[PDB]
Symmetry: C3
Subunit: 196 residues, 3 copies
């Protein structure tokens, strides 16, 4: 519903995505409350996830998310501070939307890169940048769950395309990048399905 | 599955013992010793996230008391494996249905309590439920959150404020964070986690 | 190598694939490249390629003895590039038949007299220990959980006559070495634990 790439019938365009990654679930709930009271952003999730972090996502118009996130950071940073990472994308890539809610493993798809990040925000941030840089396709993604708060995703395409994407991923992730693997020609046995 | 019933159809088994162990192997031995020592009823014996082992038992006060004595001796053997424990002569009725699995409420203030151990969560909630006119709405023990726990209590602001003081007292340093939201947003109304 | 469910069969439906290779990696991305290298080197059958709790990656393969040996050589090189990503590994030329049905998913026995519970720091240690025990003493593998929901740890249970599970315990300790976290032996579990130890 709220994760649609383009609006459902009758809804205004809400292209912007805000993501907050918090060390405290209790803090996360209060951060969400502050965000939604400040501006009429749409809450997409408010979730404890593995490692014991709390994941908040919201969408809205650019100005709405900007405003909600300002309120979110103030609360998130209160006291000892609980903000591990954050992301604001004014215009999140259409491919990205269907991967936010739950882990996705591809059945079928080409070269591939596998990107492994220290935070959920780094994965979403770098994937968005990658998808906008080269005509690559997001195939797999796992945000936090079952991998102790890490994240990873895969992108496929022509070899040069995924190499171009890989450069942008490195730049966008910075030190949040844990590992990036490129396989120009996966064995037949791995092609299409990398996780099974 | 009815073993988590607040009241029996069967004898009354009001008291709760919980043991939180760092070793699954030790956990099994602790359970065996506890159930041999006294006729407590085992509710769960579960590996949970972070790789700890969670034991719960219920019975008469004297029974849980004796089972728990035996549990501690074994749990404390060698380098020791007991991370936390709880013994309640009487667990609040609302609490029983939240022990077995994570619960998210479908549907006026709230406090959210976040603890370092499962026992701290159960201990806190029980005390709060016994002190203030609050309602337990959400709870998650260990699973998916690296061994911590959290729960939610609702009521009037004075109610959850009263609860919160009790929660702080019982948790001690096991309390990680406690948050109060006097009027949660519509999107957060009823359901806080989704 | 990936698709069909019979691939975990103790005996073939197909030629014999008695040997087992297991790789336990700290990086999911490296794990995929390791898998690719392994299967490019020799035609081993890949059984799984799985991120698991603690955020490590689990690879298992089976094949004829020589195939698994050569795939693992290729795997070790890639896993070790730059900084090693190999947490643990196992190569068994002849994996005990009982072991095959416990690889794909956690198993809890519903019903069985004496038992040992083995708890290891790595997945490979559990599989390695279990194999040694099943070959050495007349015991039965009942429960096993590899990594998932227990932060990368593993445990398994073996049942049998009391002297038999005691002998197994000795073998498990030897094979695990420092990878052993805890081992418990219960000669007579209470009836409430008998059959089901985990619930
Ligand atoms: S990673 Fe595995 S063990 Fe750690 S919290 Fe998530 S599920 Fe539990």
């Amino acid at each position: 519903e709220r994760f649609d790439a383009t609006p459902p019938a009758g809804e205004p365009d809400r292209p912007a995505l805000g993501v907050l990654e918090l060390t405290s679930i209790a803090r996360g709930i209060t951060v969400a409350d502050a965000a939604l009271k400040r501006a009429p952003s749409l809450l997409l999730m408010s979730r404890p996830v593995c490692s014991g972090k709390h994941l908040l996502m919201m969408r809205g118009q650019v100005a709405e998310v900007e405003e909600s996130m300002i309120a979110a950071r103030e609360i998130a940073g209160a006291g000892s501070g609980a903000l591990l990472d954050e992301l604001e994308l004014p215009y999140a890539h259409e491919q990205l939307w269907r991967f936010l809610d739950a882990p996705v493993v591809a059945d079928a798809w080409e070269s591939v890169i596998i990107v492994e990040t220290a935070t959920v925000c780094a994965a979403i941030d770098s994937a968005d940048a990658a998808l906008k840089t080269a005509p690559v396709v997001l195939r797999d993604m796992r945000l936090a769950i079952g991998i102790a708060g890490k994240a990873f995703f895969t992108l496929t395409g022509e070899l040069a395309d995924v190499e171009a994407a890989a450069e942008v991923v490195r730049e966008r992730c910075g030190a949040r990048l844990l590992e990036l693997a490129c396989i120009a020609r996966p064995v037949d046995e791995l092609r299409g399905r990398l996780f099974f």
